[PDB]
């Protein structure tokens, strides 16, 4: 071929028919991990 | 020789060499609650000495024509201890009793009482005499607190209820000429997994003599009846500043 540049979603679905348990969780203490801060 | 019993939790023991057996109620022992049943999701606290020992309430006077007395649980001991003060900081507790009721005489002294456990003691009144007033029971009279109130009408229970089948209930018996206690063991019985401690009494416990007392002119007539409570496996979430009532 003589002409080079002739040649040339983000999410899928679930089945979930209960809703999400929790999990247990303890204490922590430390830097560079956030998760409390987010950006609207 | 089953007649003698100790009962040791937390820092507080009891002994007795006059008694019946144990009455565990509706053959279940008291649980903390499971991941199953559970769903209020912030982690519970559990003092498991503190709260989880033997608590003495005050003591009555059996006369010859006493009518009976009555206590909500766990509104006898929200005032009381530790135990007390978490029911105050949290929303929610959950927690079973055993219950000990003493009552001692001579030989020579004869009467019976009625222990049981009713849960969700629900009172009435006499709706003015005639049935015409749609009266309610006063803030006192259903939450009488660690002293207790008397019944006015023992033989309904002062709910329309009669006593001869209160026996249908977990229950024993304290009779003068074979036992001084009685002792009944209470899970946690409700329709969800924990509650409020100060709008909601799980249970009533009665005592009610349906034998009278009787003595001759001489002996002790001075017959007093005690009650002596402990919570079994006290869980408590929701913490906020503390709440009275």
């Known amino acids: 071929d003589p002409i080079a540049d002739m040649i040339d979603s983000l999410t899928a679905l679930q089945v979930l028919p209960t809703a999400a348990n929790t999990e247990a969780s303890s204490h922590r203490l430390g830097t560079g991990v956030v998760p409390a801060l987010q950006a609207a | 020789s089953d007649r003698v019993a100790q009962l040791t939790i937390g820092n507080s023991t009891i002994t007795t060499q006059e008694a019946?057996?144990?009455?565990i109620a509706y053959g279940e022992w008291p649980e903390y609650c499971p991941d199953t049943d559970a769903t209020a999701v912030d982690k519970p606290t559990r003092p498991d000495v503190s709260v989880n020992r033997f608590f003495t309430l005050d003591t009555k006077s059996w006369a010859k024509d006493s009518k009976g007395w009555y206590w909500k649980f766990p509104d006898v001991l929200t005032e009381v201890g530790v135990f007390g003060q978490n029911a105050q900081f949290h929303y929610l507790y959950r927690s079973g009793f055993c219950v000990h009721v003493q009552c001692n005489a001579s030989k020579?002294?004869?009467?019976?009482?009625?222990?049981?456990v009713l849960p969700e003691y629900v009172l009435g009144t006499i709706a003015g005499g005639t049935g015409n007033e749609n009266s309610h029971p006063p803030y006192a009279t259903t939450q009488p607190g660690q002293v207790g109130a008397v019944l006015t009408h023992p033989y309904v229970l002062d709910a329309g209820i009669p006593l001869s089948q209160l026996t249908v209930c977990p229950h024993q018996?304290?009779?003068?000429?074979?036992?001084?206690?009685?002792?009944?063991?209470?899970?946690?019985?409700?329709?969800?997994?924990?509650?409020?401690?100060?709008?909601?009494?799980?249970?009533?416990?009665?005592?009610?003599?349906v034998v009278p007392l009787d003595f001759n002119a001489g002996a002790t007539s001075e017959i007093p009846i005690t009650v002596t409570i402990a919570p079994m496996c006290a869980e408590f979430a929701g913490l906020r500043q503390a709440v009275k009532q």
């Open chain 2, 20 to 23: 019946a057996n144990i009455v």
């Open chain 2, 173 to 209: 018996w304290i009779n003068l000429r074979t036992n001084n206690c009685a002792t009944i063991i209470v899970p946690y019985m409700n329709t969800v997994p924990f509650d409020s401690a100060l709008n909601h009494c799980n249970f009533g416990l009665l005592v009610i003599p």
């Open chain 2, 108 to 116: 020579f002294h004869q009467g019976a009482l009625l222990v049981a």
